[PDB]
Design a protein around this ligand. Structure first.
Ligand code: HEM
Length: 454
């Protein structure tokens, strides 16, 4: 019925140079603001459409019709993350395998086990902060990465990164980032396969080794342990497939460790920053949360029962996830020829790309008060129409990490607010940094301790 809009083009460079910025996802957000609920984005060799309406995304999330696609980002990350859970097709052997063997360690009862371990890390950060001098401050995104990377480490593989013991960032993180930059960077390189890009290839290739250096070291610390863990490394190593009958390959085992080491802390870092960013800008909300935290968290350290009982802290996080989904995009492909919206024709295997932040700012569904931070939006959570809100993605290919991140971050956001008054001491104008995921760049706060003992 209708042709699909398309932003400015540059001859054979098609759209590519529109996203020649350090802030792509946000440029994509502007174009979606100019062009509307869907638009064609062509780059040499790839074409993909970006959806922003709950109308369209509604259909796209329908699995009978669309399956998960590897966006050009994931097809590049396959270089280090192989065919782990995140970067593999539903149709590959190791997905459904990996899926059944690992899903168990993510039930809200596996949570129960992970709690003490989360607390371990949560106290480490709380103490880091009680121990700062006046005139010292808190570099927020840096600290959250410390925490969330210590947790996926300690819980996932029983491995202390001892992130707090360090003021120079961790030898694994450094490389991880260059990697997750070379990825974010090959994208905007029209012919990504020739050199000049051989200096970069080698830089990439020298980071993969460094990661695998650590993956090798983690396999080795499990060996010299009086191994006991229920932890997901144990699961991977010894588990078998109900569906199939076999255990996972060793090369696949490596890929998943990297996958869980990256996905594990990356997304949940941002969401905390963003959460805490919003609390310092919306001090009414802050005092509401302050209140809940002190009322519920009565024992010196929180028990699992208590964290599930932080109902409003859950809403603030969802609302932070609403405005700034830290994993802001996912792709899907036309299983069959079809017509999205009764309006837009697509052919088999045509790629489309849910643009979460714009889906999360869709008036016909949320209200006209979209840019505003109001958690109360989450009270009757029946309210959200089907597929209005998707920080965690869709159907069978959604974040297996949902319960976990959310438990984690509830617990941590819980404790900070029990323990500290906060001051945006510089009047931080928001600066979103984009690796694959989003997070506040240079967010800094002071923290007046409320002298409550742990
Ligand atoms: C609040 C934090 C998190 C956010 C916002 C988030 C977001 C997402 C999104 C959007 C996807 C789907 C991408 C796609 O369809 O291509 C995904 C998948 C995935 N996430 Fe998360 N995630 C979070 C936390 C975690 C955590 C803590 C873990 C580790 C336990 C994790 C592990 C994974 C894995 C393994 C997948 C691939 C699942 C599959 O395809 O079978 N995530 N996540």
């Amino acid at each position: 019925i209708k042709e699909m809009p398309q932003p400015k083009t540059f001859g054979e460079l098609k759209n590519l140079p529109l996203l020649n910025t350090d802030k792509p996802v946000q440029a994509l957000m502007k174009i979606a603001d100019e062009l509307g609920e869907i638009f064609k984005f062509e780059a040499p060799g790839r074409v993909t459409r970006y959806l922003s309406s709950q109308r369209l995304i509604k259909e796209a999330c329908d699995e009978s019709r669309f399956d998960k696609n590897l966006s050009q980002a994931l097809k590049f990350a396959r270089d280090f993350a192989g065919d782990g859970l995140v970067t593999s097709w539903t149709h590959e052997k190791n997905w459904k395998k990996a899926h059944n063997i690992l899903l168990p360690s993510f039930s809200q009862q596996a949570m129960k086990g992970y709690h003490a371990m989360m607390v371990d890390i949560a106290v480490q950060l709380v103490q880091k902060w009680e121990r700062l001098n006046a005139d010292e401050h808190i570099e927020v995104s840096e600290d959250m990465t410390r925490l969330t990377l210590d947790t996926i480490g300690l819980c996932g593989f029983n491995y202390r990164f001892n992130s707090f013991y360090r003021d120079q960032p961790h030898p694994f993180i450094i490389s991880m980032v260059r990697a997750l930059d070379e990825v974010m960077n090959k994208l905007q390189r029209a012919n990504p396969d020739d050199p000049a890009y051989d200096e970069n290839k080698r830089q990439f290739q020298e980071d993969i080794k460094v990661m695998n250096d650590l993956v090798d070291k983690i396999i080795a610390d499990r060996k010299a342990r009086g191994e006991q863990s229920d932890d997901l490394l144990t699961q991977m190593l010894n588990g078998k497939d109900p569906e199939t009958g076999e255990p996972l390959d060793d090369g696949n085992i490596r890929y998943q460790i990297i996958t869980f080491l990256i996905a594990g802390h990356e997304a949940t870092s941002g969401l905390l920053s963003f959460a805490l960013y919003f609390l310092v800008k919306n001090p009414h909300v802050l005092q509401k949360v302050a209140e809940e935290a002190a009322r519920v968290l009565v024992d010196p350290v929180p028990s699992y029962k208590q964290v599930k009982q932080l109902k409003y802290v859950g809403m603030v996080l969802n609302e932070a996830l609403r405005l700034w989904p830290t994993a802001p995009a996912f792709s899907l492909y036309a299983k069959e020829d079809t017509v999205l919206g009764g309006e837009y024709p697509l052919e088999k295997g045509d790629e489309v790309m849910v643009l979460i932040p714009q889906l999360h700012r869709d008036k016909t569904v949320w209200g006209d008060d979209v840019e505003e931070f109001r958690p109360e939006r989450f009270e009757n959570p029946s309210a959200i129409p089907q597929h209005a809100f998707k920080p965690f993605g869709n159907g069978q290919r959604a974040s297996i990490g949902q319960q976990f991140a959310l438990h984690e971050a509830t617990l941590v956001l819980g404790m900070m607010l029990k323990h500290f008054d906060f001051e945006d001491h510089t009047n931080y104008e928001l600066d979103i940094k984009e690796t694959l995921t989003l997070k506040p760049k240079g967010f800094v706060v002071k923290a007046k301790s409320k002298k409550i003992p742990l």
